[PDB]
Design a protein around this ligand. Structure first.
Ligand code: BM6
Ligand code: BM6
Lengths: 11, 212, 212, 11
């Protein structure tokens, strides 16, 4: 869940 | 430590039918919002799950504050991140005139009248971001501490930059309830657009509209 | 002039299934709310139509702030104006556990932790009452001026009464966005109860649920 | 409209 958001917060 | 200079830098760093154009700009800015948040002191230090919770909880208010301030020199309309100016008449003709007018009267016009600057905007957004009432937070006290540091810095900034305006700090904070109400109404509209399926909704925006 | 002593007097002057009992208390307090408002400096001087607009716009938030502060010494529950204590478990068992828990965690517990006093409560309610963003106001600037006088007096009061707590004023104001959000969700529930017709709704409460 | 409220504000 929240796939895109997690990937972007990855940094 | 929460230096207002860092918050200002975050703001400056991310600076670049009618409803379909507005939603396209929203999707675009969601990507930029993540970059903005990472530049706010201590945000990236919070656990990943909490970072997600804070962004999912405040993205509407965060984006609304941004385009509202970006539209301060615009008459009866807003300036989208895509470069397109949207006038009040266009919003009305698209069926979202009531919420559009609330943005203009409760936010844009008020920011313009008091000449809210980019540092103040950044601090208000940082306060919105560090919302300790967000459900699921692993440590709400930690987020509360960050919020407190932001408004302490904001108050210091206001008293130093605008000593002749004793009520400016309070005035700034009192735009938050309006922002909260408008954000909720905006979300309701977005859920409806999604439900109806007559408006294109990009992937990130769509993801923000998914259940927790 | 907006003396905090007058606001305190207004508060002191009005001090005395699960959902059906809660709605009964709400109807009862609406009558008391009108008496409270009349005791707030300058409210009765505003034109009658504006008095109506301000009350119709803020009754939910005004009543919520009141029973929340009245429940500060209550554990995991609220104290209704009828004298009945309602526990979190009872609210949950009635289908309104989520909104009930928001009241407890975002308002009651926060008021208790900072020991918000009756003067501060009264000022926050006065700020809520004097909402310049209320639609239809004949003179929004006049209401804005009254709000400004209230928060100027509140800040002075906080610095004098609690000099050791520099962030108290800001902390107080920052409970307003939460109050706004909870009030809106409460209204949604009330509209649903009315729609379903399975919960008794008294005349004044019913009138507040009518269209503008 | 707002019958009760008007009457009560009458004072
Ligand atoms: C519901 C609808 C179309 C009504 C009118 C307003 C302008 C409030 C609006 C705003 C948004 C928006 C948004 C719009 C523009 C921008 C931008 O240009 O930066 C960023 C975000 O999305 C999330 C929050 O705010 C989405 C939908 C709507
Ligand atoms: C929706 C429902 C039943 C859910 C739970 C809470 C306690 C928030 C609630 C509160 C209200 C109330 C209200 C309740 C109690 C009192 C009181 O006892 O003073 C005054 C007002 O009505 C208007 C605003 O708040 C009405 C309905 C609900």
């Amino acid at each position: 869940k929240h796939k895109i958001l997690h990937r972007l917060l990855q940094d | 430590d929460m230096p207002v200079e860092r918050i200002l830098e975050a703001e400056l760093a991310v600076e670049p039918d009618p409803v379909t154009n507005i939603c396209q700009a929203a999707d675009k800015q969601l990507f930029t919002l993540v970059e903005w948040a990472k530049r706010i002191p201590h945000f990236s230090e919070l656990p990943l799950d909490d970072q997600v919770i804070l962004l999912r909880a405040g993205w509407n208010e965060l984006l609304i504050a941004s385009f509202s301030h970006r539209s301060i020199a615009v008459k009866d309309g807003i300036l989208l991140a895509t470069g397109l100016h949207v006038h009040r008449n266009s919003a009305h003709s698209a069926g979202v005139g009531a919420i559009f007018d609330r943005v203009l009267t409760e936010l844009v016009s008020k920011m313009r009248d008091m000449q809210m600057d980019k540092t103040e905007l950044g601090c208000l957004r940082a306060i919105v971001l560090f919302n300790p009432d967000s459900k699921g937070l692993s440590n709400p006290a930690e987020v509360e501490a960050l919020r407190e540091k932001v408004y302490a810095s904001l108050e210091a900034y206001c008293k130093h930059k605008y000593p002749e305006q004793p009520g400016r700090f309070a005035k700034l904070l009192l735009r938050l309830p309006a922002l909260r109400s408008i954000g909720l109404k905006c979300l309701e509209h977005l859920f409806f657009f999604k439900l109806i399926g007559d408006t294109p909704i990009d992937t990130f925006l769509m993801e923000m509209l998914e259940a927790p």
